[PDB]
Amino acid sequence: AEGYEQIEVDVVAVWKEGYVYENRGSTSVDQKITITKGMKNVNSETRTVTATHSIGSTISTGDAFEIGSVEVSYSHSHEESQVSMTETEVYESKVIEHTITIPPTSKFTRWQLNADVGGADIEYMYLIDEVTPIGGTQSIPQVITSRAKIIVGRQIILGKTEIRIKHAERKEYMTVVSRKSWPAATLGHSKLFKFVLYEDWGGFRIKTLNTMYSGYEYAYSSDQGGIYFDQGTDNPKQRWAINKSLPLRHGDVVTFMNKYFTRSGLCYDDGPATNVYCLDKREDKWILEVVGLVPR
Numbered sequence: 001a002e003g004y005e006q007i008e009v010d011v012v013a014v015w016k017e018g019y020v021y022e023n024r025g026s027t028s029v030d031q032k033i034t035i036t037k038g039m040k041n042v043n044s045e046t047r048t049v050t051a052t053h054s055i056g057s058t059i060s061t062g063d064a065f066e067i068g069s070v071e072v073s074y075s076h077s078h079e080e081s082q083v084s085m086t087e088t089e090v091y092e093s094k095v096i097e098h099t100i101t102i103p104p105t106s107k108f109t110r111w112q113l114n115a116d117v118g119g120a121d122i123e124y125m126y127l128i129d130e131v132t133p134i135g136g137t138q139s140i141p142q143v144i145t146s147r148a149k150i151i152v153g154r155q156i157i158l159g160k161t162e163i164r165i166k167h168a169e170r171k172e173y174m175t176v177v178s179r180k181s182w183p184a185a186t187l188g189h190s191k192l193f194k195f196v197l198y199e200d201w202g203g204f205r206i207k208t209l210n211t212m213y214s215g216y217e218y219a220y221s222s223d224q225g226g227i228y229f230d231q232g233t234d235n236p237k238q239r240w241a242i243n244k245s246l247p248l249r250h251g252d253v254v255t256f257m258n259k260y261f262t263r264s265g266l267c268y269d270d271g272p273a274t275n276v277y278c279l280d281k282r283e284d285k286w287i288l289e290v291v292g293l294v295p296r
């Protein structure tokens, strides 16, 4: 995908009890059994998963990623074997069902292999099964190498990477126009409006590469709430807070809270001229898009 990348990473997997039936008497008893091989509470509208917990140095809680493939290696019965998963397999619920004939004086142990890719609980990645005598020894499976390959947005380097900021609900880009002889933010369909994100002691700064008044390039909130662009200063009014852990990445959905008006977030609002405002106790979702390449 245009702006994403694959990365290998270690994930946690374990063999659970699953189901256990004991037939201590005679004769052979039949039992129906149903299991659902699939990711727990999987969203049908998307494959992007918001991390509930970390996956090493690469993923942190709240980070967006997509599971490309998962490869867990196990040892049973005294022999090694490995099972791989496709993207379609990790995101599908297969309700496997059938009858198991338990022979007399024997236990049926259906083991349940799972995987927790940073919060994403893959219930029943695999089913081994094991019929064994009572009270005889049985082989317990053990995961030897659990690992996954995730898909993430290309990183945004602060003060370096040129991005486009797009309003998620309205699918329109933040653009710059003149208002009161100052540069001003307003929503538009143009892909020509590039920005650079910075970070210092006071917060994040949104610099425009499309100003008409030279030097007036950092986004800030007026007392009235309208978003204008000023010259670089120490003022909190031009400093912002992002609700997402670094590193920022392509396609990240974020909110921008003002550092001076601390409860006022950046959003769409029908102004008389422009429509990008800082409004109290409300904060709209914006997409960060890493720019492609211009032709020449």
Ligand SMILES: C[N+](C)(C)CCOP(=O)(O)O
Binding pocket: 076, 077, 127, 128, 129, 130, 131
């Ligand atoms: C994995 N399996 C249950 C389909 C075959 C292996 O049976 P067993 O290893 O418990 O004897």
Ligand SMILES: C[N+](C)(C)CCOP(=O)(O)O
Binding pocket: 180, 222, 223, 224, 225, 226, 271, 272
């Ligand atoms: C007046 N307004 C609330 C619609 C936005 C204008 O902000 P401002 O340009 O007066 O600083």
Ligand SMILES: C[N+](C)(C)CCOP(=O)(O)O
Binding pocket: 221, 222, 223, 224, 225, 226, 261, 264, 277, 278, 279, 280
């Ligand atoms: C937008 N509001 C009128 C609800 C309050 C926010 O004022 P402001 O923080 O944008 O200056």
Ligand SMILES: C[N+](C)(C)CCOP(=O)(O)O
Binding pocket: 233, 234, 235, 236
């Ligand atoms: C006082 N100072 C000039 C060193 C910093 C002031 O930054 P500012 O918020 O007044 O623009």
Ligand code: NA
Binding pocket: 199, 200, 201
């Ligand atoms: Na600094």
Ligand code: NA
Binding pocket: 220, 230, 233, 235, 237, 238
């Ligand atoms: Na300012």
Ligand code: NA
Binding pocket: 269, 270, 271, 272, 273, 274, 275
């Ligand atoms: Na408007």
